[PDB]
Design an enzyme around this catalytic site. Structure first.
Site, PDB file in Angstrom:
ATOM      1  N   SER B 156       0.815  -1.208   0.000  1.00  0.00           N
ATOM      2  CA  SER B 156       0.000   0.000   0.000  1.00  0.00           C
ATOM      3  C   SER B 156       0.853   1.263   0.000  1.00  0.00           C
ATOM      4  O   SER B 156       1.923   1.315   0.611  1.00  0.00           O
ATOM      5  CB  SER B 156      -0.932  -0.001   1.211  1.00  0.00           C
ATOM      6  OG  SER B 156      -1.440   1.297   1.457  1.00  0.00           O
ATOM      7  N   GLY B 157       0.364   2.289  -0.697  1.00  0.00           N
ATOM      8  CA  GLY B 157       1.135   3.472  -1.019  1.00  0.00           C
ATOM      9  C   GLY B 157       1.961   3.404  -2.286  1.00  0.00           C
ATOM     10  O   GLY B 157       2.569   4.414  -2.660  1.00  0.00           O
ATOM     11  N   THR B 161      -4.155   2.638  -6.700  1.00  0.00           N
ATOM     12  CA  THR B 161      -5.408   3.331  -6.978  1.00  0.00           C
ATOM     13  C   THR B 161      -5.269   4.295  -8.149  1.00  0.00           C
ATOM     14  O   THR B 161      -6.139   4.347  -9.021  1.00  0.00           O
ATOM     15  CB  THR B 161      -5.886   4.069  -5.728  1.00  0.00           C
ATOM     16  OG1 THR B 161      -5.875   3.176  -4.608  1.00  0.00           O
ATOM     17  CG2 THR B 161      -7.301   4.593  -5.933  1.00  0.00           C
ATOM     18  N   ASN B 202       2.795   0.981   7.889  1.00  0.00           N
ATOM     19  CA  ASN B 202       2.112   1.714   6.830  1.00  0.00           C
ATOM     20  C   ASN B 202       0.749   2.177   7.312  1.00  0.00           C
ATOM     21  O   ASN B 202      -0.005   1.394   7.895  1.00  0.00           O
ATOM     22  CB  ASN B 202       1.958   0.854   5.574  1.00  0.00           C
ATOM     23  CG  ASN B 202       1.651   1.680   4.341  1.00  0.00           C
ATOM     24  OD1 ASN B 202       1.569   2.907   4.406  1.00  0.00           O
ATOM     25  ND2 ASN B 202       1.479   1.012   3.208  1.00  0.00           N
ATOM     26  N   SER B 205      -3.165   1.077   4.910  1.00  0.00           N
ATOM     27  CA  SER B 205      -3.099  -0.240   4.292  1.00  0.00           C
ATOM     28  C   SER B 205      -4.507  -0.741   4.004  1.00  0.00           C
ATOM     29  O   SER B 205      -5.420  -0.550   4.807  1.00  0.00           O
ATOM     30  CB  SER B 205      -2.362  -1.220   5.202  1.00  0.00           C
ATOM     31  OG  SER B 205      -2.270  -2.501   4.603  1.00  0.00           O
ATOM     32  N   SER B 206      -4.680  -1.400   2.862  1.00  0.00           N
ATOM     33  CA  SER B 206      -5.957  -2.003   2.504  1.00  0.00           C
ATOM     34  C   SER B 206      -5.946  -3.488   2.834  1.00  0.00           C
ATOM     35  O   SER B 206      -5.041  -4.214   2.413  1.00  0.00           O
ATOM     36  CB  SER B 206      -6.259  -1.800   1.019  1.00  0.00           C
ATOM     37  OG  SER B 206      -6.537  -0.441   0.733  1.00  0.00           O
ATOM     38  N   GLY B 428       0.329  -7.126  -1.828  1.00  0.00           N
ATOM     39  CA  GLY B 428       1.429  -8.013  -2.141  1.00  0.00           C
ATOM     40  C   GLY B 428       1.969  -8.766  -0.936  1.00  0.00           C
ATOM     41  O   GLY B 428       1.512  -8.616   0.195  1.00  0.00           O
ATOM     42  N   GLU B 430       4.044 -10.022   2.159  1.00  0.00           N
ATOM     43  CA  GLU B 430       4.173  -9.194   3.349  1.00  0.00           C
ATOM     44  C   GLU B 430       5.059  -9.885   4.376  1.00  0.00           C
ATOM     45  O   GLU B 430       4.910 -11.083   4.628  1.00  0.00           O
ATOM     46  CB  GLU B 430       2.793  -8.907   3.951  1.00  0.00           C
ATOM     47  CG  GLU B 430       2.772  -7.834   5.015  1.00  0.00           C
ATOM     48  CD  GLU B 430       1.361  -7.454   5.427  1.00  0.00           C
ATOM     49  OE1 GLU B 430       0.749  -8.198   6.221  1.00  0.00           O
ATOM     50  OE2 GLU B 430       0.863  -6.408   4.957  1.00  0.00           O
TER      51      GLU B 430
HETATM   52  N1  LIG Z   1       1.688   7.218 -11.685  1.00  0.00           N
HETATM   53  C1  LIG Z   1       1.631   8.134 -10.717  1.00  0.00           C
HETATM   54  N2  LIG Z   1       1.740   9.437 -11.054  1.00  0.00           N
HETATM   55  C2  LIG Z   1       1.682  10.359 -10.090  1.00  0.00           C
HETATM   56  N3  LIG Z   1       1.528  10.189  -8.774  1.00  0.00           N
HETATM   57  C3  LIG Z   1       1.423   8.887  -8.469  1.00  0.00           C
HETATM   58  C4  LIG Z   1       1.463   7.826  -9.354  1.00  0.00           C
HETATM   59  N4  LIG Z   1       1.321   6.620  -8.681  1.00  0.00           N
HETATM   60  C5  LIG Z   1       1.202   6.981  -7.427  1.00  0.00           C
HETATM   61  N5  LIG Z   1       1.257   8.336  -7.223  1.00  0.00           N
HETATM   62  C6  LIG Z   1       1.151   9.041  -5.954  1.00  0.00           C
HETATM   63  O1  LIG Z   1       1.266   8.098  -4.909  1.00  0.00           O
HETATM   64  C7  LIG Z   1       0.428   8.496  -3.798  1.00  0.00           C
HETATM   65  C8  LIG Z   1      -0.513   7.371  -3.444  1.00  0.00           C
HETATM   66  O2  LIG Z   1      -1.086   6.827  -4.650  1.00  0.00           O
HETATM   67  P1  LIG Z   1      -2.457   6.046  -4.592  1.00  0.00           P
HETATM   68  O3  LIG Z   1      -2.829   5.421  -5.938  1.00  0.00           O
HETATM   69  O4  LIG Z   1      -3.481   6.984  -4.077  1.00  0.00           O
HETATM   70  O5  LIG Z   1      -2.147   4.824  -3.627  1.00  0.00           O
HETATM   71  P2  LIG Z   1      -2.990   4.441  -2.373  1.00  0.00           P
HETATM   72  O6  LIG Z   1      -4.101   5.401  -2.106  1.00  0.00           O
HETATM   73  O7  LIG Z   1      -2.060   4.406  -1.129  1.00  0.00           O
HETATM   74  N6  LIG Z   1      -3.633   2.915  -2.614  1.00  0.00           N
HETATM   75  P3  LIG Z   1      -2.701   1.809  -1.741  1.00  0.00           P
HETATM   76  O8  LIG Z   1      -1.324   1.763  -2.323  1.00  0.00           O
HETATM   77  O9  LIG Z   1      -3.365   0.376  -1.809  1.00  0.00           O
HETATM   78  O10 LIG Z   1      -2.623   2.282  -0.241  1.00  0.00           O
HETATM   79  C9  LIG Z   1      -0.239   9.806  -4.215  1.00  0.00           C
HETATM   80  O11 LIG Z   1       0.483  10.923  -3.713  1.00  0.00           O
HETATM   81  C10 LIG Z   1      -0.190   9.737  -5.741  1.00  0.00           C
HETATM   82  O12 LIG Z   1      -0.170  11.032  -6.329  1.00  0.00           O
HETATM   83 MG   LIG Z   2      -5.082   1.461  -1.325  1.00  0.00          MG
END
Ligand SMILES: Nc1ncnc2c1ncn2[C@@H]1O[C@H](COP(=O)(O)OP(=O)(O)NP(=O)(O)O)[C@@H](O)[C@H]1O
Ligand SMILES: [Mg+2]
Ligand SMILES: Nc1ncnc2c1ncn2[C@@H]1O[C@H](COP(=O)(O)OP(=O)(O)O)[C@@H](O)[C@H]1O
Ligand SMILES: [Mg+2]
Ligand SMILES: [Mg+2]
Lengths: 184, 747
Positions: B156-157, B161, B202, B205-206, B428, B430
């Site tokens: 996650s992160g 998404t 983290n 986390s999902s 993924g 862990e």
């Molecule tokens: N391809 C990308 N281009 C720009 N910013 C990205 C990109 N991929 C991820 N980020 C940045 O990464 C951070 C988190 O991305 P995000 O898709 O929202 O993951 P998430 O919410 O944490 N989902 P998860 O990883 O399961 O926890 C944000 O600040 C996004 O802007």
């Molecule tokens: Mg997520």
């Protein structure tokens, strides 16, 4: 998938069901009746012998026999009738498809287990089976690995001490007092 | 040998996982290497390994990591590090897989001109981009009606998404438009609130797998979307490890408690309630849960959950929280009772509209019915606590399925779906300093997904080998089925755990003893940790992971007493609570068995479909834009199975060349005697001279297939020939020019 049958022959009540459900869905007395009066009405569908709750319902006209006395099976053809009735009528399950688990009192003759196994394999064609001690199962039932079980059904009473899952076979006591001879 | 003077090798280093070194004296068989570093070093060559050789620079930076001739950890890490830091490219193929690195920065690449540039183009044509995966799935769906999946994995992160967001934005742009993408993005706040938790490593986390199906009509217009969920971590609702929280919604709710609406719930601060209190850490740094509540309710409104249902949901959650405070006094070894006039149970009954006396009776007794006859009997304080926590978990899981179904009602559309493309966001592999039933389930789900991946890649290799008419036998399958049979077979770890749950006086010490009995010396993948009798090790695809037994029996138990459900079904205060249940063996199922079943539903959903894989990696912990950390990334490339995928490709024929481009590259080696106008036969003649072993390469119909070493060896001998020719020519030129200056010296 496939779930073992669990059957406890007792004396008096038969109780039977499927493994991993919590109470038996067949319970009925291990009793066989044969009619003793001259039948009068032609065309009645009159029947050679009755088993279980049938023989309780009609018991006014029947001689009632118990095929098990003091945990020993004395009469084998009636015991086969009681098992046939249990599997086909009470559970409505074909025995070829299910392992069967059978319960017995300690210190009773070996011929009883040999015949129970020969019958379950040869006539019923049960794929797999096991014979378990009545007292041991009451610890599984009461959530314990230690204790002296006192068990009394109809017929035999027995004590079996168990400590952390080891039986103590020199200390097993068996008594023929319980249950039917209280009624007599 | 390959280790000559002016060779280059990777040597291990504490502070960046590998560093470059130049081989300062050529190696002979023995124990010494003199090495030079970008200064001067000597390195012990020791059992045995030679240090990993380094790829020739023509290969470094190419769009596909399998184009590298030496395939190994530092070459992969170097190609990703150079593309990311120097190029600021964030996408890189590995075989079929797309690797995507979180930049923590905005980028121009998602413009609709680039969307159009990718549309209709096959993966060979264009540099990798998430649109190049979306477009592949789209055209696979067009060719053949078979549905398509896109599968996104990583810690996650890592940006899973945003990757899904741009993936569906691609579909919306290419199909045209029906306002799905707005609704799907508006649903994310509630699914993140109910489904995400802080974890030791983290935040956010999902803890569940989320599957979005984008449905298409016969035109391949976007109809609408459907959302499924799998693998929910139910056990977190009632238990957390240290520095962990419950699902965010509970803390958003508690922090809201001062608001006028929530006054009736009699909520306290988040460390009052037993289920929130345990983790140690009520406050996440840099998040205002009270503010997050507003975004949650806003997204509920936008998806059209009425504020009646919203107050229903918050009622039910405050129910679960007050329920967790109910405290049993044991009046005997086999009996318990709830202390009289108990305030937690009084508030729970008031909130939920049930008779206090019926909850107070049924919480402490359980009922068994023979077909003629029924017995009420008491239960110990331990069984009462286990049953209260199984009730709280069952309420939570039904509320979750209800919120998901009311989202699905907002996303569905009435047009019949002709086919769909589906996007799976899943966690993924862990590993933490402590590993527990949650990590064990997550690693088993990942073993299943990795098996289905390996078998898809093997299928595609058999197809490409048919296409080039090369014997199939050369490629061997690499099968993690023994570890799956270790975990899930009968007499497996989960099977012995579900046995030990019902066993009388079961405990984590006797479960561990049964583990050591069955598998200590029978399986190579199961090992006991040297110093402990309470833990066990499984050798997973990625790494060995050591699990502690000490939690699993508490976390594994579910059993829900029907009478306690029927009390809640009897409630008439509010309508949501009977609606949740409306829907018998399942009430007996353990958490591990519900998990294994949800995983079989997921594997059925995926095996129906043709997958495309995306792996997301998170290059640094501190979210610095376009910074990269080798020790973080090597961890995540290992956890994403990229490094094992590459290891599995390094055996076989990873490097593939068209006869045209091969001939173009290596004309320098060919003598003008042996250059035919048929290139293919020239190449077949030449490579057998240049490489001794026919095993080391295969002649396909249109492409030459090489084993890993060979292309770098040919590049080395090419470069050394060109060096000799250059030196000889330039000495001739210098000699002429000095002879000209001598002619001047005579003149
Ligand atoms: N391809 C990308 N281009 C720009 N910013 C990205 C990109 N991929 C991820 N980020 C940045 O990464 C951070 C988190 O991305 P995000 O898709 O929202 O993951 P998430 O919410 O944490 N989902 P998860 O990883 O399961 O926890 C944000 O600040 C996004 O802007
Ligand atoms: Mg997520
Ligand atoms: N509530 C009761 N009170 C006293 N005796 C009972 C009661 N129920 C059954 N019995 C007696 O106990 C015997 C039945 O016990 P049971 O455990 O069914 O026998 P078995 O173990 O042989 O199947 C019978 O003699 C019956 O009369
Ligand atoms: Mg008995
Ligand atoms: Mg985010």
């Amino acid at each position: 998938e496939t779930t073992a049958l669990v059957c406890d022959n007792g004396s008096g009540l038969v109780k039977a069901g499927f493994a991993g459900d919590d109470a038996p869905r067949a319970v009925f007395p291990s009793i066989v009746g044969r009619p003793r009066h001259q039948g009068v009405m032609v065309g009645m569908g009159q029947k050679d012998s009755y088993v279980g709750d049938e023989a309780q319902s009609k018991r006014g006209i029947l001689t009632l026999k118990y095929p098990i006395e003091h945990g020993i099976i004395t009469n084998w053809d009636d015991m086969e009738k009681i098992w046939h009735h249990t599997f086909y009528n009470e559970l409505r399950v074909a025995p070829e498809e299910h392992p069967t688990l059978l319960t017995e009192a300690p210190l009773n003759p070996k011929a009883n287990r040999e015949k129970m196994t020969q019958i379950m394999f040869e006539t019923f064609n049960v794929p797999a089976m096991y014979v378990a001690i009545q007292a041991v199962l009451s610890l599984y039932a009461s959530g314990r690995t230690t204790g002296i079980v006192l068990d009394s059904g109809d017929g035999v009473t027995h004590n079996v001490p168990i400590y952390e899952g080891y039986a103590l076979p020199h200390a097993i006591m068996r008594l023929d007092l319980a249950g039917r001879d209280l009624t007599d | 040998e390959l280790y000559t003077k002016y060779a280059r090798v990777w040597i291990p280093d504490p502070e960046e996982v590998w560093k470059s070194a130049e081989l300062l004296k050529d190696y002979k068989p023995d124990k010494v290497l003199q090495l030079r570093l970008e200064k001067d070093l000597e390195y012990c060559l020791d059992p045995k390994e030679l240090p990993p050789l380094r790829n020739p620079d023509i290969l470094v930076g190419e769009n596909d990591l399998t184009a590298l001739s030496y395939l190994h950890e530092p070459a992969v890490l170097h190609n990703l590090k150079v593309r990311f830091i120097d190029s600021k490219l964030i996408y890189t193929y590995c075989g079929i897989v797309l690797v995507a690195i979180n930049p923590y920065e905005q980028l121009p690449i998602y413009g609709e001109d680039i969307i159009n540039a990718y549309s209709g183009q096959n993966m060979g044509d264009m540099d990798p981009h998430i649109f190049a995966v979306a477009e592949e799935a789209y055209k696979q769906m067009a060719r053949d009606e078979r549905n398509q999946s896109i599968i996104v994995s990583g810690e996650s992160g890592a940006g899973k998404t945003v990757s899904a967001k741009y993936a569906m934005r691609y579909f919306a742009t290419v199909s045209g438009s029906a306002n799905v993408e707005e609704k799907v993005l508006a649903s994310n706040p509630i699914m993140e609130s109910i489904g995400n938790a802080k974890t030791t490593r983290n935040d956010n986390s999902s803890r569940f797998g989320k599957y979005i199906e984008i449905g298409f009509d016969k035109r391949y217009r976007i109809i609408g979307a459907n959302m499924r969920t799998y693998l929910l971590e139910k056990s977190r609702v009632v238990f957390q490890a240290e520095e962990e929280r419950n699902y965010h919604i509970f803390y958003q709710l508690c922090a809201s408690a001062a608001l006028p609406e929530f006054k009736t719930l009699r909520l306290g601060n988040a460390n009052y309630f037993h289920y929130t209190k345990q983790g140690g850490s009520p406050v996440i740094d840099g998040i205002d849960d009270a503010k997050e509540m507003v975004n949650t309710r806003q997204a509920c409104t936008l998806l059209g959950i009425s504020d009646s249902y919203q107050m229903g949901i918050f009622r039910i959650l405050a129910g679960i929280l007050h329920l967790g405070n109910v405290e049993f006094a044991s009046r005997d070894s086999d009996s318990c009772a709830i202390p009289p006039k108990h305030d937690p149970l009084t508030i729970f009954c008031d909130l939920m509209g049930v008779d206090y006396e019926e909850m107070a009776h049924w919480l402490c007794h359980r009922k068994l019915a023979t077909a003629t006859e029924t017995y009420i009997k008491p239960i110990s304080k331990l069984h009462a606590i286990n049953a209260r926590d199984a009730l709280a978990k069952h309420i939570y899981a039904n509320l979750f399925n209800w919120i998901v179904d009311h989202v699905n009602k907002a996303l569905h559309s009435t047009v019949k779906q002709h086919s769909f493309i589906g996007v799976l966001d899943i966690y993924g592999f862990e590993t933490f300093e402590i590993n527990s039933f949650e990590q064990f389930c997550i690693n088993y789900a990942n073993e299943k997904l990795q098996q289905q991946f390996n078998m898809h890649v093997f299928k595609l290799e058999q197809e490409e080998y048919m296409k080039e008419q090369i014997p199939w036998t050369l490629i061997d399958f690499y099968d993690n089925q023994p570890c799956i049979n270790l975990i899930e077979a009968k007499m497996g770890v989960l099977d012995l755990l579900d046995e030990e749950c019902k066993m009388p006086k079961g405990s984590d010490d006797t479960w561990a003893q049964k583990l050591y009995n069955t598998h200590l010396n029978k399986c190579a993948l199961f090992e006991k940790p040297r110093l402990s009798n309470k833990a066990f090790i499984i050798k997973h695809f990625a790494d060995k992971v050591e699990y502690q037994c000490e939690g699993f029996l508490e976390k594994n138990k579910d059993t829900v007493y029907e009478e306690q459900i029927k009390v809640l079904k009897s409630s008439k205060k509010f309508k949501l609570l009977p609606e949740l249940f409306q829907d018998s063996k399942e009430h007996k199922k353990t958490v591990g068995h519900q998990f294994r079943n949800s995983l079989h539903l997921l594997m059925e959903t995926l095996n129906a479909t043709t997958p495309h894989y995306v792996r997301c990696i998170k290059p640094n912990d501190f979210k610095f834009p376009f910074t990269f950390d080798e020790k973080r990334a090597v961890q995540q490339l290992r956890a994403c199975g990229v490094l094992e995928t590459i290891r599995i490709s390094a055996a076989g024929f990873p490097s593939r060349w068209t006869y045209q481009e091969f001939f173009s590259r290596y004309r320098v080696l060919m003598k003008q005697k042996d250059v035919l106008s048929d290139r293919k036969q020239t190449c077949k003649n030449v490579l057998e001279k240049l490489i001794l072993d026919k095993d080391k390469y295969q002649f396909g119909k249109t492409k030459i297939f090489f084993r890993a070493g060979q292309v770098a060896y040919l590049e080395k001998i090419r470069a050394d020939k060109l060096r000799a020719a250059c030196i000889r020519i330039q000495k001739t030129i210098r000699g002429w020019l000095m002879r000209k200056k001598y002619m001047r010296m005579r003149r």
